[PDB]
Design an enzyme around this catalytic site. Structure first.
Site, PDB file in Angstrom:
ATOM      1  N   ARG A  49      13.111 -48.843 -22.162  1.00 23.38           N
ATOM      2  CA  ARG A  49      12.145 -47.777 -21.908  1.00 23.38           C
ATOM      3  C   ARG A  49      12.572 -46.479 -22.582  1.00 23.38           C
ATOM      4  O   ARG A  49      13.689 -46.001 -22.375  1.00 23.38           O
ATOM      5  CB  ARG A  49      11.973 -47.565 -20.401  1.00 23.38           C
ATOM      6  CG  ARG A  49      11.015 -46.452 -20.008  1.00 23.38           C
ATOM      7  CD  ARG A  49      10.937 -46.343 -18.499  1.00 23.38           C
ATOM      8  NE  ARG A  49      10.057 -45.270 -18.045  1.00 23.38           N
ATOM      9  CZ  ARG A  49      10.465 -44.103 -17.550  1.00 23.38           C
ATOM     10  NH1 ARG A  49      11.757 -43.823 -17.435  1.00 23.38           N
ATOM     11  NH2 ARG A  49       9.569 -43.205 -17.161  1.00 23.38           N
ATOM     12  N   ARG A  90       6.428 -29.726 -17.155  1.00 24.02           N
ATOM     13  CA  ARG A  90       7.890 -29.740 -17.221  1.00 24.02           C
ATOM     14  C   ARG A  90       8.443 -28.322 -17.364  1.00 24.02           C
ATOM     15  O   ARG A  90       7.735 -27.418 -17.809  1.00 24.02           O
ATOM     16  CB  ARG A  90       8.388 -30.614 -18.378  1.00 24.02           C
ATOM     17  CG  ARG A  90       7.892 -32.049 -18.357  1.00 24.02           C
ATOM     18  CD  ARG A  90       8.872 -32.983 -19.038  1.00 24.02           C
ATOM     19  NE  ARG A  90       9.932 -33.416 -18.128  1.00 24.02           N
ATOM     20  CZ  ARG A  90       9.900 -34.529 -17.397  1.00 24.02           C
ATOM     21  NH1 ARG A  90       8.857 -35.350 -17.451  1.00 24.02           N
ATOM     22  NH2 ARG A  90      10.920 -34.825 -16.603  1.00 24.02           N
ATOM     23  N   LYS A 238       0.747 -45.814 -15.129  1.00 25.68           N
ATOM     24  CA  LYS A 238       1.643 -45.325 -14.084  1.00 25.68           C
ATOM     25  C   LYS A 238       0.871 -44.586 -13.000  1.00 25.68           C
ATOM     26  O   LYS A 238       0.196 -43.590 -13.274  1.00 25.68           O
ATOM     27  CB  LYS A 238       2.719 -44.399 -14.657  1.00 25.68           C
ATOM     28  CG  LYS A 238       3.669 -45.056 -15.641  1.00 25.68           C
ATOM     29  CD  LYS A 238       4.997 -44.316 -15.700  1.00 25.68           C
ATOM     30  CE  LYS A 238       4.928 -43.072 -16.550  1.00 25.68           C
ATOM     31  NZ  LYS A 238       6.190 -42.292 -16.469  1.00 25.68           N
ATOM     32  N   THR A 296      11.877 -46.033 -10.114  1.00 23.79           N
ATOM     33  CA  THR A 296      12.496 -44.767  -9.694  1.00 23.79           C
ATOM     34  C   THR A 296      13.357 -44.799  -8.421  1.00 23.79           C
ATOM     35  O   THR A 296      12.875 -45.112  -7.329  1.00 23.79           O
ATOM     36  CB  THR A 296      11.471 -43.604  -9.637  1.00 23.79           C
ATOM     37  OG1 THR A 296      10.627 -43.657 -10.793  1.00 23.79           O
ATOM     38  CG2 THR A 296      12.189 -42.260  -9.605  1.00 23.79           C
TER      39      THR A 296
HETATM   40  N1  LIG Z   1      15.535 -40.031 -24.262  1.00 26.43           N
HETATM   41  C1  LIG Z   1      16.291 -39.273 -23.429  1.00 26.43           C
HETATM   42  N2  LIG Z   1      17.126 -38.315 -23.907  1.00 26.43           N
HETATM   43  C2  LIG Z   1      17.881 -37.556 -23.082  1.00 26.43           C
HETATM   44  N3  LIG Z   1      17.873 -37.678 -21.737  1.00 26.43           N
HETATM   45  C3  LIG Z   1      17.081 -38.597 -21.121  1.00 26.43           C
HETATM   46  C4  LIG Z   1      16.227 -39.465 -21.957  1.00 26.43           C
HETATM   47  N4  LIG Z   1      15.552 -40.273 -21.119  1.00 26.43           N
HETATM   48  C5  LIG Z   1      15.941 -39.950 -19.859  1.00 26.43           C
HETATM   49  N5  LIG Z   1      16.855 -38.955 -19.852  1.00 26.43           N
HETATM   50  C6  LIG Z   1      17.486 -38.340 -18.646  1.00 26.43           C
HETATM   51  O1  LIG Z   1      17.674 -39.299 -17.599  1.00 26.43           O
HETATM   52  C7  LIG Z   1      16.728 -39.128 -16.534  1.00 26.43           C
HETATM   53  C8  LIG Z   1      15.988 -40.447 -16.304  1.00 26.43           C
HETATM   54  O2  LIG Z   1      14.762 -40.260 -15.597  1.00 26.43           O
HETATM   55  P1  LIG Z   1      13.360 -40.778 -16.207  1.00 26.43           P
HETATM   56  O3  LIG Z   1      13.613 -41.530 -17.494  1.00 26.43           O
HETATM   57  O4  LIG Z   1      12.588 -41.448 -15.092  1.00 26.43           O
HETATM   58  O5  LIG Z   1      12.587 -39.416 -16.600  1.00 26.43           O
HETATM   59  P2  LIG Z   1      12.073 -38.342 -15.511  1.00 26.43           P
HETATM   60  O6  LIG Z   1      12.593 -36.992 -15.948  1.00 26.43           O
HETATM   61  O7  LIG Z   1      12.382 -38.822 -14.112  1.00 26.43           O
HETATM   62  O8  LIG Z   1      10.467 -38.338 -15.708  1.00 26.43           O
HETATM   63  P3  LIG Z   1       9.528 -39.647 -15.542  1.00 26.43           P
HETATM   64  O9  LIG Z   1      10.442 -40.744 -15.042  1.00 26.43           O
HETATM   65  O10 LIG Z   1       8.474 -39.225 -14.538  1.00 26.43           O
HETATM   66  O11 LIG Z   1       9.002 -39.874 -16.938  1.00 26.43           O
HETATM   67  C9  LIG Z   1      15.813 -37.984 -16.953  1.00 26.43           C
HETATM   68  O12 LIG Z   1      15.558 -37.105 -15.856  1.00 26.43           O
HETATM   69  C10 LIG Z   1      16.546 -37.285 -18.084  1.00 26.43           C
HETATM   70  O13 LIG Z   1      17.302 -36.171 -17.596  1.00 26.43           O
HETATM   71  O1  LIG Z   2       7.580 -42.275 -14.122  1.00 26.53           O
HETATM   72  C1  LIG Z   2       8.227 -42.504 -13.054  1.00 26.53           C
HETATM   73  O2  LIG Z   2       8.914 -43.546 -12.852  1.00 26.53           O
HETATM   74  C2  LIG Z   2       8.175 -41.459 -11.927  1.00 26.53           C
HETATM   75  O3  LIG Z   2       7.511 -40.421 -12.103  1.00 26.53           O
HETATM   76  O4  LIG Z   2       8.806 -41.709 -10.891  1.00 26.53           O
HETATM   77  K   LIG Z   3       7.075 -39.284 -18.237  1.00 25.30           K
HETATM   78 MG   LIG Z   4       6.551 -39.867 -13.890  1.00 32.07          MG
HETATM   79 MG   LIG Z   5      11.596 -40.957 -13.303  1.00 31.37          MG
END
Ligand SMILES: Nc1ncnc2c1ncn2[C@@H]1O[C@H](COP(=O)(O)OP(=O)(O)OP(=O)(O)O)[C@@H](O)[C@H]1O
Ligand SMILES: O=C([O-])C(=O)[O-]
Ligand SMILES: [K+]
Ligand SMILES: [Mg+2]
Ligand SMILES: [Mg+2]
Ligand SMILES: O=P(O)(O)OC[C@H]1O[C@@](CO)(OP(=O)(O)O)[C@@H](O)[C@@H]1O
Ligand SMILES: [K+]
Length: 498
Positions: A49, A90, A238, A296
């Site tokens: 992912r 964000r 999502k 999550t």
């Molecule tokens: N490509 C990336 N580069 C740098 N840091 C990342 C990357 N992907 C994820 N992270 C870090 O690890 C965490 C993993 O969480 P996640 O991938 O679910 O994103 P999120 O910020 O929770 O938003 P969402 O999950 O809703 O898209 C993030 O909060 C971010 O700080």
């Molecule tokens: O994208 C997700 O997994 C969230 O927002 O928890």
């Molecule tokens: K996202």
């Molecule tokens: Mg999300």
């Molecule tokens: Mg997340």
């Protein structure tokens, strides 16, 4: 009954020779190297992912190339998922990487674009333009999947708001911010998102994890944006907001699948309501025959520790019991200290939960909830699974080029592995979000079209033979079309394996 079934179980009950649930990992600083990815794949990753709310296009390009290389060097097919930004809000960059927010402190939130690359514990950026026309003195601003809360105290100027830090939390670069019950009028598919979707299509990603899906028309907006070149790309919507839950039926029918995005969801709606929402969305998807992901904070504490909490072990097991196709890891693999260990635990818990999972009752329950009459191809699949249970067949083989037939069989949850023999490599990857299916690639280019099905069947049976699912003298349920029919599988046969 479940009660009665629980009394049949034991802690010494040995696990299956296969795992049905699939594991999704998010790739980041901790796991981007071609070496770290091979560790993930060997631990049990089926889907990489990429969160497009972080990094950049050149950064995620490296991920794409590394995943493919790591996969090619292990001789396995691995799905690449593009996770949209979506109609989201964000924060932005902080000086030095992170900002410590302490209980009782006072900070400022600005909508001035100049503070985007320069943010602190006292003053930082938030990318929602008309934020000031939405919040009033006293209202709460939720940060980092709702872990941090700020109470607005006063308006400093046209674009700045004085706040109070209600609890102690450390936040990192571009944090998610949620405004529950405000009606944020962000576009369905933004100008930024259309570039990302255009990027994924060019790079030939397998699926899109579409963020903050609110309506069926929005799903159509994504597919319109995807264009003709990327119509075989799967949209996994999502659910992470209030109206996403409400429009779930129309959303599901438009999507190719669902993610229960509990992080954003657990702030946008009350946290205790996420359990019910999870039970509903999974079951609904199971009935529809579409992949569903529980996501999550499932093994959150393993971002820091070598071992999970008792609640985390329970959470993963119950997602399986719930009937999820996939379980996902976020910050545990993206920026955790034990990326291999976490995926290893998840697989171990998934496999254990499967042991106690009653797939026969599962099969019957799903069978009862389908509209009669069924279509010929669905009836074929349902009855093939029935044969498995009656005959105690130890494997199943399905010929599927688009993935349609394989997902239709998996939908009925047999208690043996489903071996899908496919003529397409993208189908091998795409079926990585479908529980209980293993794909085998048949190169119709050099081996032939196989109009008589004989060659692809023999390849499925040999795969299952080599995996140790079936031996000489076992039964194997085979699904495909007869000599005449095109477009779907009209035929089932039970064959004695040699
Ligand atoms: N490509 C990336 N580069 C740098 N840091 C990342 C990357 N992907 C994820 N992270 C870090 O690890 C965490 C993993 O969480 P996640 O991938 O679910 O994103 P999120 O910020 O929770 O938003 P969402 O999950 O809703 O898209 C993030 O909060 C971010 O700080
Ligand atoms: O994208 C997700 O997994 C969230 O927002 O928890
Ligand atoms: K996202
Ligand atoms: Mg999300
Ligand atoms: Mg997340
Ligand atoms: O690609 P999906 O939609 O799964 O359809 C697969 C079914 O279509 C058929 C019917 O033609 O294709 P195939 O020509 O490969 O034999 C069935 O054999 C096969 O099971
Ligand atoms: K079982």
């Amino acid at each position: 009954s479940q009660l009665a079934h629980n009394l049949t179980l034991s802690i010494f009950d040995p696990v299956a020779n296969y795992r049905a649930a699939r594991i999704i990992c998010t790739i980041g600083p901790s796991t981007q190297s071609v070496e770290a990815l091979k560790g993930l794949i060997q631990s049990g990753m089926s889907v990489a992912r990429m969160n497009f709310s972080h990094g950049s296009h050149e950064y995620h390009q490296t991920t794409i190339n590394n995943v493919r290389q790591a996969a090619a060097e292990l001789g396995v097919n691995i799905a690449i998922a593009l996770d949209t930004k979506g109609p989201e809000i964000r924060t932005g960059q902080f000086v030095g990487g992170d900002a410590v927010m302490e209980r009782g402190a006072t900070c400022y939130v600005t909508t001035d674009p100049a503070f985007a690359d320069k943010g602190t514990k006292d003053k930082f950026y938030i990318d929602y333009q008309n934020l000031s026309k939405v919040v009033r003195p006293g209202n709460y601003i939720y940060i980092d999947d709702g872990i941090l809360i700020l109470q607005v105290q006063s308006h400093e100027d046209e674009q700045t708001l004085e706040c109070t830090v209600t609890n102690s939390h450390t936040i990192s670069d571009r944090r998610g911010v949620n405004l529950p019950g405000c009606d944020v009028d962000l576009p369905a598919v933004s100008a930024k998102d259309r570039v990302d979707l255009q990027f994924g299509v060019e790079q030939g990603v397998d699926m899109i994890f579409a963020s903050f899906i609110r309506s069926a028309e929005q799903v159509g907006d994504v597919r319109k944006a995807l264009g003709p070149k990327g119509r075989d790309i799967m949209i996994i919507c999502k659910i992470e907001n209030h109206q996403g839950v409400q429009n779930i039926d129309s959303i599901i029918e438009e999507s190719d699948g669902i993610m229960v995005a509990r992080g954003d969801l657990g702030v946008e709606i009350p946290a205790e309501k996420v359990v019910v929402a999870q039970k509903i969305l999974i079951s609904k998807c199971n009935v529809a025959g579409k992949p569903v992901i529980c996501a999550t904070q499932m093994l959150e504490s393993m971002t820091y520790n070598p071992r999970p909490t008792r609640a985390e072990v329970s959470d993963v097991a119950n997602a399986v019991f719930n009937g999820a196709d996939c379980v996902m890891l976020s910050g545990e693999t993206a920026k955790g200290k034990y990326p291999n260990e976490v995926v290893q635990y998840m697989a171990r818990i998934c496999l254990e939960a499967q042991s106690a999972l009653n797939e026969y009752v599962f099969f019957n329950s799903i069978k009862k909830l389908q509209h009669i009459p069924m279509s010929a191809d669905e009836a074929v699949c349902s009855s093939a699974v029935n044969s498995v249970y009656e005959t105690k067949a130890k494997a199943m083989v399905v010929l599927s080029n688009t993935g349609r037939s394989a997902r239709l069989v998996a939908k009925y949850r047999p208690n043996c592995p489903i071996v899908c023999v496919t003529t397409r490599l993208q189908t091998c990857r795409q079926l990585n979000i479908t529980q209980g299916v293993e794909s085998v690639f048949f190169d119709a280019d050099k081996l032939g079209h196989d109009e008589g099905k004989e060659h692809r069947v023999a390849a499925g049976v040999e795969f299952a033979k080599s995996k140790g699912y079936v031996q000489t003298g076992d039964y194997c349920v085979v699904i495909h079309a007869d000599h005449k029919v095109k477009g779907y599988a009209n035929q089932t046969r039970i064959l004695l394996v040699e």
